[PDB]
């Protein structure tokens, strides 16, 4: 029920400014206060600010102070935080959470945090995934495979099967090309017999360029 | 503005060995400190708050300790599940997040299941080809990738992308990527995959003819 | 560095009750209410957002609004009838503690109570210090309102009449005190001693003398 | 979980006190400390403030330059050195634990849930004066015929603040402490008094615990037929 639900991945300009919702379910937004988490590629978590959404009140980190502006609108459930004067360090993934105050123990804690939301400080153009098949040449395993290559900005998602086929899904993180363009492979590794019986569909979907592609492997 | 010491930085520990983490501050916290589960490519969960109050819903065998300046996490029995960045954040004054621990699994060693994937016709027809070799589930970490076309060793060609470890068997997948011309992939036939690992005896290969 | 709210509100037995606190600190902070009684610490009845401690019936509930405040008793019982002191936490510069100027709340103005009237003569001991005086004892009573007259056999005294402004029982009723100081040789003179304690036209005259 | 204040009592004008609050039951370092004081009949007023252990001080303006606010960790006493004191300083001083620090988050939502007793101060160019007990011999018009009204009359006491127990405490039924007159002479007045058996009025002894603070009298009279 207790759901912080956060707006799709952007990718701005450097000197730009970005705005990131924050969408708040099954809880009163009121009845709590919002934090805003920074998170750098593969570096620790950086606290950005908090509000009051009930009343208004911010208290920002010195750092990010001056850059950060966090707002909230109660009667649409929404925190939003804004950014600007984009810089290349600040291209990280942000996290909206809620805390709420424990009246047995006397004590409030962040407990629930948002999905996420990725942010890319580039001035390249916006590109749709090439997909490629992944099939060999002619033991018991064998193994499938989609090539999402030439695209911007990060990221992508590869589903099998319409999200029934799980297990043996191996999505690699993309890797940067010295063409400024992103590329990922996701395999499946499924057993010989299943194959030639079953249909073997990938679900790639890039939500920047509203591209979503639907490629059988045989 | 309290500074954060988070030690250790990476661990590597056998499923049901005793972890343990300590988050050490600049200044006393009053026991206003918490634990969260950060994992891979997933939102951070809290486990543990003001030192030892554990969250509903939480395993048992995570608990906190500590007071003033010293605070200290552990799990009990370290499970395939528990595979993480663990964090530890004051909230006294202000709020800082420690630097994080790399929670891995210690395992037997798993041999690399590998397999070479030619350019499709497809992606031929843009005048590029990207041959892809695969090590599906495989322990420990460390593997080598040695492309080859026609005997002729490939450096520089190559571009590789591991996996976070898995949240059942514990064991990583490899990805290395050779990337040539229309034209240089026509000039030549056998393109292989010389894949070195400790699961290996001898270094293995796997290629393909082209045609 | 003001918070302001009505000096006196007025309820009924059932009947429900919203006491305003007016602050420029009410905007950024969170109004904290206290009950007190008189001779009484202050209590703590609501707090932060509608936050109400143990113990505390569910009849108060904590309202807000801006600059506004607000304490609302549901169902207004005797018990409840006290000074409110609403209270914030500023956060700027050097006065971080703002308290208003309280709210007297009176609930029904019934059921009335009559006076209990207990007269003492002046002590042995009290006469051989060459000192004398009859100690007039009203107590369990409502309104509080009473007027004490002192008489000599028949006469009425005027001086020498010290006596209490009613005050709050624990039953939450009234009570009152009355002393005439005398010299042995007045009080030897007589002849007996009244005291008549009226009430609501109702008078209760209790009677000594030297016997 | 307690908070008892010591040191208040009679200071003439200009003078000095003096004022010692002690924490119980709780960690007094890693809380906020204030002072809150009463002028009777008049609401609360804030004095003073001290944090967690930072240890950030605040004042109100018109005790400013006077009263210096400190704590001893160590010892769990909050401490108030109220100096150059007016007549208007008269009142009856709360110490109250303020659960979140200025410095702390969440101190929006603060508040003192945890109170003190109340140590009475009064500011007068007049002396202090103890009481004269007198025992209330026994009345048999009130509250049956097989009970019986005794009484202690505290006669002629200065400041306020006098304490009236019956039997070392023990007897608590019955007890009923009226409130004191401010007589003319400017000395206040008290009575209590405690319905007790008729039958048991000769068997069972009653003495009441009359104590002054501020003068360090304590009388136990016995009050007989
Ligand atoms: C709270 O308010 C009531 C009502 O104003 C006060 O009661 C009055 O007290 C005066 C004497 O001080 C009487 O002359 C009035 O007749 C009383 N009115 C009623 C309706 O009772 C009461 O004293 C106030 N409480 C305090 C502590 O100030």
């Known amino acids: 029920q207790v759901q912080l639900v956060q707006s799709g991945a952007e990718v701005k300009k450097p000197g730009a400014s970005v705005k990131v919702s924050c969408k708040a379910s099954?809880?009163?937004?009121?009845?709590?206060?919002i934090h805003w988490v920074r998170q750098a590629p593969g570096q620790r978590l950086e606290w950005m600010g908090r509000?009051?959404?009930?009343?208004?009140?911010?208290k920002y980190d010195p750092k990010f102070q001056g850059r950060v502006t966090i707002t909230a609108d109660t009667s649409a459930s929404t925190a939003y935080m804004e950014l600007s004067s984009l810089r290349s360090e600040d291209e990280a993934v942000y996290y909206c959470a809620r805390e709420g105050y424990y009246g047995n123990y006397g004590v409030y804690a962040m407990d629930y945090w948002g999905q996420g939301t990725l942010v890319t400080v580039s001035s390249a153009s916006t590109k749709g995934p090439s997909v490629f098949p992944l099939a060999p040449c002619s033991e018991s395993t064998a193994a499938l495979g989609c090539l999402v290559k030439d695209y911007f900005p990060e990221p992508v998602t590869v589903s099998w099967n319409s999200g029934a086929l799980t297990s043996g899904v191996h999505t690699f993180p993309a890797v940067l090309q010295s063409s400024g363009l992103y590329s990922l492979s996701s395999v499946v590794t499924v057993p010989s017999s299943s194959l030639g019986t079953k249909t073997y569909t990938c679900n790639v979907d890039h939500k920047p360029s509203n591209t979503k592609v639907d490629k059988r492997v045989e | 503005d309290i500074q954060m010491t988070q030690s250790p930085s990476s661990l590597s520990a056998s499923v049901g060995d005793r972890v343990t983490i300590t988050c050490k501050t600049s200044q006393d916290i009053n026991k206003y400190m918490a634990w969260y589960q950060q994992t891979p490519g997933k939102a951070p969960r809290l486990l543990i708050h003001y030192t030892s109050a554990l969250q509903p819903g939480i395993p048992s065998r995570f608990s906190g300790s500590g007071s003033g300046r010293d605070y200290t996490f552990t799990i009990s029995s370290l499970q395939p599940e528990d595979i993480a960045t663990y964090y530890c954040?004051?909230?006294?004054?202000?709020?800082?997040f420690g630097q994080g621990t790399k929670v891995e699994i210690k395992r037997t060693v798993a041999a690399p299941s590998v397999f070479i994937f030619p350019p499709s016709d497809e992606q031929l027809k843009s005048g590029t080809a990207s041959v892809v070799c695969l090590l599906n589930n495989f322990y420990p970490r460390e593997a080598k990738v040695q492309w080859k076309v026609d005997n002729a060793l490939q450096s520089g060609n190559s571009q590789e992308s591991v996996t976070e470890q898995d949240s059942k068997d514990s064991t990583y997948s490899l990805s290395s990527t050779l990337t040539l011309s229309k034209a240089d992939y026509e000039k030549h036939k056998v393109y292989a995959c010389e894949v070195t690992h400790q699961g290996l005896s001898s270094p293995v290969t796997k290629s393909f003819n082209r045609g | 560095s003001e918070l302001t709210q009505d000096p006196a509100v007025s309820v009924a037995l059932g009947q429900t009750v919203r006491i305003t606190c007016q602050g420029d600190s009410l905007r950024s902070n969170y109004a904290s209410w206290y009950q007190q009684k008189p001779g009484q610490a202050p209590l703590l009845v609501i707090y932060g957002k509608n936050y109400r401690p143990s113990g505390i019936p569910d009849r108060f509930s904590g309202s807000y609004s801006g600059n506004t405040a607000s304490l609302t008793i549901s169902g207004a019982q005797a018990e409840d009838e006290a000074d409110y002191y609403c209270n914030s936490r500023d956060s700027s510069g050097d006065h971080p503690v703002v308290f208003g100027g309280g709210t007297n709340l009176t609930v029904l103005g019934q059921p009335k109570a009559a006076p209990s009237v207990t007269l003492f003569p002046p002590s042995s001991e009290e006469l051989q210090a060459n000192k004398a005086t009859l100690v007039c004892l009203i107590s369990d009573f409502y309104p509080g309102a009473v007027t004490v007259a002192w008489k000599a056999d028949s006469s009425p005294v005027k001086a020498g009449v010290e006596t209490t402004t009613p005050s709050k029982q624990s039953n939450n009723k009234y009570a009152a005190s009355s002393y005439l100081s005398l010299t042995p040789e007045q009080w030897k003179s007589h002849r007996s001693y009244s005291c008549q304690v009226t009430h609501e036209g109702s008078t209760v005259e209790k009677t000594v003398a030297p016997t | 979980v307690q908070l008892v204040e010591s040191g208040g009592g009679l200071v003439k004008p200009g003078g000095s006190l003096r004022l010692s609050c002690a924490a119980s039951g709780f960690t007094f370092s890693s809380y906020s400390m204030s002072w809150v004081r009463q002028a009777p009949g008049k609401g609360l007023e804030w004095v003073s403030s001290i944090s967690r252990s930072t240890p950030y001080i605040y004042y109100a303006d018109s005790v400013k330059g006077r009263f210096t606010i400190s704590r001893d960790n160590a010892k769990n006493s909050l401490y108030l050195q109220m100096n150059s004191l007016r007549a208007e300083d008269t009142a009856v001083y709360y110490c109250a634990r303020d659960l979140w620090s200025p410095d702390s988050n969440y101190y929006d939502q603060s508040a003192f849930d945890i109170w003190g007793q109340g140590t009475m101060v009064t500011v007068s160019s007049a002396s202090t004066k103890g009481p004269s007990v007198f025992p209330l011999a026994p009345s048999s018009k009130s509250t049956s015929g097989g009970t019986a009204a005794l009484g202690c009359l505290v006669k002629d006491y200065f400041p306020e603040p006098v304490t009236v127990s019956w039997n070392s405490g023990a007897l608590t039924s019955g007890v009923h402490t009226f409130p004191a007159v401010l007589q003319s002479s400017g000395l206040y007045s008290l009575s209590s008094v405690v319905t007790v058996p008729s039958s048991s009025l000769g068997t069972q002894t009653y003495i009441c615990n009359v104590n002054h603070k501020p003068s360090n009298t304590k009388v136990d009279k016995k009050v007989e037929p």
């Open positions: 509000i009051d959404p009930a009343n208004g009140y911010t």
């Open positions: 099954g809880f009163n937004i009121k009845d709590t206060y």
């Open positions: 954040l004051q909230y006294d004054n202000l709020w800082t």
